[PDB]
């Protein structure tokens, strides 16, 4: 069945620590405990290690990623800007 209606993953804390804090911890605990699809092997076995380290069960290929998700949107912006300024007139 559906055992909780709102708290989702944050129900392990209970009635303490505060509403907005649980609300803001929800949206990134789901991110850090979610399995991600590896861009290398194509399986869905990414798992977060210690902070900043991501690991896939197949092929043991360990990628330095974001602290809570797999890619920071700012980091994707920086990578697009780096390839643009790369092929901009060859330095």
């Amino acid at each position: 069945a559906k055992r909780t209606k709102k708290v989702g993953i944050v129900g392990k804390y209970g009635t303490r620590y505060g509403a907005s804090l649980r609300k803001m911890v929800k949206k990134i605990e789901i991110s850090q405990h979610a399995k991600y699809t590896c861009s290398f092997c194509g399986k869905t076995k990414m798992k977060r290690r210690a902070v900043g380290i991501w690991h896939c069960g197949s092929c043991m290929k360990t990628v330095a990623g974001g602290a809570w998700t797999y890619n920071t949107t700012s980091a994707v912006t920086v990578k697009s800007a780096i390839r643009r300024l790369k092929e901009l007139k060859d330095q």
Partner: protein, 51 residues
């Protein structure tokens, strides 16, 4: 004690027949098996430390 993840990049030493091992701060988006290019005229991508 450091929030940054720490990369262990191995180099070839051009003077003694020996591999040397250094410790770089892991730039966002490198992974085990990506080559790291460093030097003056090194091409510009993520991880490539250059002047």
């Amino acid at each position: 004690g450091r929030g940054a993840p720490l990369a262990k990049v191995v180099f070839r030493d051009p003077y003694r027949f020996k591999k040397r091992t250094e410790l770089f701060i892991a730039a966002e988006g490198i992974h085990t098996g990506q080559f790291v290019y460093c030097g003056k005229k090194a091409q510009l991508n993520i991880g490539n430390v250059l002047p």
